[PDB]
């Protein structure tokens, strides 16, 4: 068997970043109540913390 023992999970490569993550056309932006906004546009935002990261 040439392949791995366990299938790899956790992070996509460059070619799958191209297929997914097509640029988001966000119509009527930020119209909702807070918490229903795209916070995952923000480069500081942990999804499983629901908070923006800091320097420590």
């Amino acid at each position: 068997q040439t392949s791995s023992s366990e299938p790899r999970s956790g992070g996509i490569g460059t070619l799958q970043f191209i297929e997914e993550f097509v640029p988001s056309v966000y119509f009527n932006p930020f119209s909702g109540p807070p918490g229903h906004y795209p916070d995952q546009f923000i480069p500081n935002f942990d999804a499983v913390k629901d908070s923006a990261d800091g320097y420590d």
Binding site: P29, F30, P34, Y37, P38, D39, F41, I42, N44, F45, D50, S51, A52, D53, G54
Partner: protein, 50 residues
């Protein structure tokens, strides 16, 4: 002519920051980076002066 002189020794830039909560100051950051939420200003005089 009257001998008044001025001499600028040093200079510093100061900036007071509102200590906003980091998950609130990131929601305001994200809202203010749209093309629809551009901070638009106007000169109070609003005149071209000749």
């Amino acid at each position: 002519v009257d001998g008044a002189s001025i001499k600028f020794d040093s200079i510093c830039l100061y900036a007071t920051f509102f200590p906003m909560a980091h998950n609130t100051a990131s929601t305001l950051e994200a809202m203010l980076r749209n093309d629809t939420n551009d901070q638009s200003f106007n000169d109070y005089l609003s005149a071209a002066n000749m």
